[PDB]
Design a protein around this ligand. Sequence first.
Ligand SMILES: CC(=O)N[C@H]1[C@@H](O[C@H]2[C@@H](O)[C@@H](CO)O[C@@H](O[C@H]3[C@H](O)[C@@H](O)[C@@H](O)O[C@@H]3CO)[C@@H]2O[C@@H]2O[C@@H](C)[C@@H](O)[C@@H](O)[C@@H]2O)O[C@H](CO)[C@H](O)[C@@H]1O
Ligand SMILES: CC(=O)N[C@H]1[C@@H](O[C@H]2[C@@H](O)[C@@H](CO)O[C@@H](O[C@H]3[C@H](O)[C@@H](O)[C@@H](O)O[C@@H]3CO)[C@@H]2O[C@@H]2O[C@@H](C)[C@@H](O)[C@@H](O)[C@@H]2O)O[C@H](CO)[C@H](O)[C@@H]1O
Ligand SMILES: CC(=O)N[C@H]1[C@@H](O[C@H]2[C@@H](O)[C@@H](CO)O[C@@H](O[C@H]3[C@H](O)[C@@H](O)[C@@H](O)O[C@@H]3CO)[C@@H]2O[C@@H]2O[C@@H](C)[C@@H](O)[C@@H](O)[C@@H]2O)O[C@H](CO)[C@H](O)[C@@H]1O
Ligand SMILES: CC(=O)N[C@H]1[C@@H](O[C@H]2[C@@H](O)[C@@H](CO)O[C@@H](O[C@H]3[C@H](O)[C@@H](O)[C@@H](O)O[C@@H]3CO)[C@@H]2O[C@@H]2O[C@@H](C)[C@@H](O)[C@@H](O)[C@@H]2O)O[C@H](CO)[C@H](O)[C@@H]1O
Lengths: 303, 301, 304, 301
Amino acid sequence: KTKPFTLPILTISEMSNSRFPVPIDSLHTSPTENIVVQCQNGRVTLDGELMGTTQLLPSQICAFRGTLTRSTLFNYYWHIQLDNLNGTPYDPAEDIPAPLGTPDFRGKVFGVASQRNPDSTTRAHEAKVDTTSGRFTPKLGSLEITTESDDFDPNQPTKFTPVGVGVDNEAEFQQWSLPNYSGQFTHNMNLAPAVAPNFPGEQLLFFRSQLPSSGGRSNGVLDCLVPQEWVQHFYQESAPAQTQVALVRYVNPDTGRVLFEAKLHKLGFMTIAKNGDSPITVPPNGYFRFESWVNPFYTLAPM
Amino acid sequence: TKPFTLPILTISEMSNSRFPVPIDSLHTSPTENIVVQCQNGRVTLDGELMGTTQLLPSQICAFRGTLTRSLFNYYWHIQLDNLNGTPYDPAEDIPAPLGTPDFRGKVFGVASQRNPDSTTRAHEAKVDTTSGRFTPKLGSLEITTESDDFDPNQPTKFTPVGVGVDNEAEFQQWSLPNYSGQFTHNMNLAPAVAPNFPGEQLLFFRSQLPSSGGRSNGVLDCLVPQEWVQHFYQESAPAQTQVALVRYVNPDTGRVLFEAKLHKLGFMTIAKNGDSPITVPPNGYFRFESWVNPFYTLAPM
Amino acid sequence: SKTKPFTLPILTISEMSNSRFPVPIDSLHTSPTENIVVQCQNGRVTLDGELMGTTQLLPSQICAFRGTLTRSTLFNYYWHIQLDNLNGTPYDPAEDIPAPLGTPDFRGKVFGVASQRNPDSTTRAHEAKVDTTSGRFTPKLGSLEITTESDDFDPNQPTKFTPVGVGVDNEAEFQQWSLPNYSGQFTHNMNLAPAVAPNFPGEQLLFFRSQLPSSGGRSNGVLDCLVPQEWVQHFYQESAPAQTQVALVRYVNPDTGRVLFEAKLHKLGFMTIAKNGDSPITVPPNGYFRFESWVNPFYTLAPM
Amino acid sequence: TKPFTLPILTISEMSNSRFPVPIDSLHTSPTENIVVQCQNGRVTLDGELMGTTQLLPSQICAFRGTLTRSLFNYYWHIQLDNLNGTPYDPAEDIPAPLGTPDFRGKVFGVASQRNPDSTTRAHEAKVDTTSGRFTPKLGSLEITTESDDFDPNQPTKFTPVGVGVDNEAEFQQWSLPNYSGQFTHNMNLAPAVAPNFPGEQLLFFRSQLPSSGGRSNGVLDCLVPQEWVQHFYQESAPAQTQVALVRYVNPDTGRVLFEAKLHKLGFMTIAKNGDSPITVPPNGYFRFESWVNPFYTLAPM
Ligand SMILES: CC(=O)N[C@H]1[C@@H](O[C@H]2[C@@H](O)[C@@H](CO)O[C@@H](O[C@H]3[C@H](O)[C@@H](O)[C@@H](O)O[C@@H]3CO)[C@@H]2O[C@@H]2O[C@@H](C)[C@@H](O)[C@@H](O)[C@@H]2O)O[C@H](CO)[C@H](O)[C@@H]1O
Ligand SMILES: CC(=O)N[C@H]1[C@@H](O[C@H]2[C@@H](O)[C@@H](CO)O[C@@H](O[C@H]3[C@H](O)[C@@H](O)[C@@H](O)O[C@@H]3CO)[C@@H]2O[C@@H]2O[C@@H](C)[C@@H](O)[C@@H](O)[C@@H]2O)O[C@H](CO)[C@H](O)[C@@H]1O
Ligand SMILES: CC(=O)N[C@H]1[C@@H](O[C@H]2[C@@H](O)[C@@H](CO)O[C@@H](O[C@H]3[C@H](O)[C@@H](O)[C@@H](O)O[C@@H]3CO)[C@@H]2O[C@@H]2O[C@@H](C)[C@@H](O)[C@@H](O)[C@@H]2O)O[C@H](CO)[C@H](O)[C@@H]1O
Ligand SMILES: CC(=O)N[C@H]1[C@@H](O[C@H]2[C@@H](O)[C@@H](CO)O[C@@H](O[C@H]3[C@H](O)[C@@H](O)[C@@H](O)O[C@@H]3CO)[C@@H]2O[C@@H]2O[C@@H](C)[C@@H](O)[C@@H](O)[C@@H]2O)O[C@H](CO)[C@H](O)[C@@H]1O
């Protein structure tokens, strides 16, 4: 009678990052006591409630849509009046931190800005979005893009396709530092809650990708709490969470053996019994399998 | 015994299965003068992938491999791997590496590299799927770039963005490229589809891709959204008949706006004549009614 | 080789416009103001031609706006307005002004008409109200909320607002000397033009007063501006150097030739007179203000 | 002798002199098929007001007076006062009360009242300048309203907002109304104007007025911005010749963009052929050069 909780059957190479439109590259764990893990994309509860700036379309994370105008080697600056991701007009009064899909990290997003005018003429060129700029105010409804080309028409529909990071100094990319969605004017609000292991000996487990970089030595490391397919899956199923913690096992269908076990928390993140920064090597055909709802005081087997 | 289901998705919550973009609209058109045989976004209702179709929405018209050398004046040779990094085998029974573009034209995007020493580069790139150097079935294709800042023998990725044709007629979404060039003809193709009932036309999930120049409409039609590709692969529910009856319902008013056939090979038809968009309200969604037979007469739209 | 002389335009009272609303001036008025803080932001100009607050030159754009209309998330329909600059430029909150130029500088409900013209040339216009006390009145952040009786508005279409008068239900909701919160409750008012007051014994502010139309109720529509809009425009054009902090002006009758009274025009752009009590200042139809001389601020005005 | 000057104003700092709205653009057109004889915004270079032109920017197409009774289907009679509240004298040598509309159509606005007991009303109203009851020269006109909430015999003001025509052809900005209705013809008109040099057309200060319905472009052209009306009235500089030479200058580049004639009767001409906007940078302004004669040959635009 109770709708059962499930996970989609996917290997590591069949999963997508929920903070950027790229495939998942690996599984990774590291200590996070020094940091506040409060990303806003890829935030979903196990019973299907989206949080933060999270939405369903994989391609739309860190993308935007709106109208370009002239503002007040990447020298050309442009003002973007943002619409909603689905084309509907944007209202700053909605109780989200920023338009859905807005980047949730400090740095420069490298991508391509494109335009299609009513007379059917089109143009597209490389563009960057400085999420640390004082004119990055997507919650207010606008942001600034930088371009190398001057081939852009004002008052024309503009789209931005995210590709990767485009910071000059590698330290400009801080994946766990939220931008100021209202610039200097207001604080961030309506945020999805921060996450941390509530248990001795446990660390967060990440679905990790290495984003493309347009220059420099940036590793492009972007960790999401849960892949986008699970966001989409939990939203569809909305199965009741019987406890705060679902027990999950990573299994190898060839050998039939459990490689490790982990906690999948109701708030939408994973923990594992392991210490220290390290990748988690999995077989190509392995997948995560839901074992049972469990009490939060369950002790995971170490790695 | 596993029932067939559709995910509950709005028009604005669907992704094109032939390009990593959202669906913009629903469209119908007569198709007797075109061959509808795209190879991405090809799935049967019981969850079998066909053509070059794979699961990752970002990897459609993307590639992965190694770059070597020889106004987008700079030409580069790309030795293709599989999207999962494993080496591509031209002997497998697919038309080309999974996610290879299935239309003639120039795919506009960004090529990027990350070297073992951690140095990186990314610049605009075009993939001409009509060039004789476009032989992804043989394991290689060619890109053109405007920037010369690329390192040979380095891991290279391609992020698709849109179309980049100079002449608008270069983009032909219903003409498959030659996956092996002029060395041989295409093989292992997902079958072509057509309406097979009087007064019926295909129903398309339409996107308008970005265009880097010119007047190209960038129109790209797919047979089912990528989310249905992913959902049918997961569910693998047995197809009880050749045709599923599906209805589009407005949850605000409770009313059915139109009905359609969802065919086992993974495409939809409606009772409609003429090239036309299908205007649907923002909260509408497709509902699976039941399995029927091909002789069902749909209500005209 | 002399400096540019300071001048006033020659205008009677029935030839002047309010600088806080697009209406003519009805009368001159004086009133004690030690109770209140006089800090309006429209119609603020220095005598040497510097605009302050939200003051701009176009008389019709005071309390007007333009932007893109959006549906919100009896005047019972609510709409969101993404505000542009009055010239179609996107509004920059980083500019050192309290709010977009022309933004209303008082608490209450501005009554007017909102209109739209679509790219397909279709048009609409209907009555609308701007509640400057609503928590969604955040023009400094680039948006505000209008309310309408009609539902005939298209979202995501270019929209203008023409101000007409006040539209409060209860008369006490209109407080001309209370500034709105230009960012709502989210941050403080910034870059305000300074407050004004007579810093001389026996002196009170002199106002150019209009009675705005009202859409209902018993509101007197009284709106006092420090300086008429024609002087805002004139001082900006002339930018004559201010020799002292006080210019002595006299209201003269060209028929009789006699001086009716004298007043101080202060450099910050306001006027004082030697008078006490709330009272209108009756003037002849042909009378006008005449610049007499720069004076030291301790000059003593003749009473009345 | 007082020299002639223009105020230093940007295009976005000028007001229409025929309606209380900002100037939207500059515009030129051949005008041999129209009569350019507006009555608001009429001033000579030496400061003489003409037609129905007055100083208050908010009072153009406004009125003041006393209302009585006679889908905007409520009709009301307005006994007109002067804009300064003084009674209107039809005997004066003006075409109509100052500020009276100078085009055929329906002026859309808001009529408001304030009673001696301080009760107030305001609702949408229209002034049809083509109606037989539009006789402002005789001292009265007629409004229509949607609301019935109006008290007879009370002081009534009209605030113009834009046009309110149902058919778009009813708005004829170059057709003067009959200020006395059918009783007699218009009198005391400001003179009509026309270019008088080969290749020269009038240059208009153009606004696009709000429209309460339909597809009317709301285009309203004035010969001179209201600020120039106010400036020349203040200055009253002697017009040394019939024509002033004026140039449009960009301060961001120092370059002159075009030159024009400013004629003594208060209108401008340029060397241009066709109906066209005049694109100007945001910081440009008109600069008075000197007095010339009507035989000057402007450089083509
Ligand atoms: C993020 C971005 O838009 N980058 C641009 C930009 O990258 C070059 C500049 O960032 C430049 C600043 O000094 O540094 C270049 O690299 C140095 C490197 O830091 C040194 O350690 C040494 O190797 O000399 C290099 C000379 O370039 C940046 O070049 C980029 O990064 C390098 C690590 C390498 O991968 C190179 O191929 C990259 O181009 O400007 C370049 C154009 O010159 C690109 O437009 C890039 O996107
Ligand atoms: C696909 C691609 O890489 N396009 C480039 C390239 O586009 C320009 C060329 O296609 C060029 C050939 O002469 O024509 C330009 O547009 C003309 C158009 O053909 C005329 O009909 C008329 O409209 O003048 C236009 C001036 O550009 C192409 O420009 C691009 O397309 C236009 C329709 C317009 O949208 C413009 O903004 C575009 O840039 O070269 C340009 C660089 O100049 C771009 O690099 C573009 O990506
Ligand atoms: C500002 C606004 O939107 N006004 C509307 C609104 O006005 C009427 C309501 O505000 C109503 C609320 O009770 O009160 C009315 O006047 C009452 C008055 O309060 C009573 O003391 C008594 O005198 O009865 C009156 C009604 O006959 C408001 O009416 C308006 O104000 C009156 C003094 C008078 O001037 C009348 O003509 C006005 O309409 O709602 C009305 C709807 O009829 C209008 O839409 C008005 O603009
Ligand atoms: C000038 C005025 O008072 N206008 C009113 C009035 O306008 C509507 C009527 O004029 C009506 C006559 O049938 O036509 C409407 O628009 C049609 C349009 O003619 C058709 O071509 C098609 O587009 O369908 C439209 C449906 O409205 C007029 O509506 C107004 O003009 C339209 C172009 C559109 O912009 C609409 O939003 C406007 O309201 O009546 C309406 C109320 O019904 C208003 O009161 C308007 O001010």
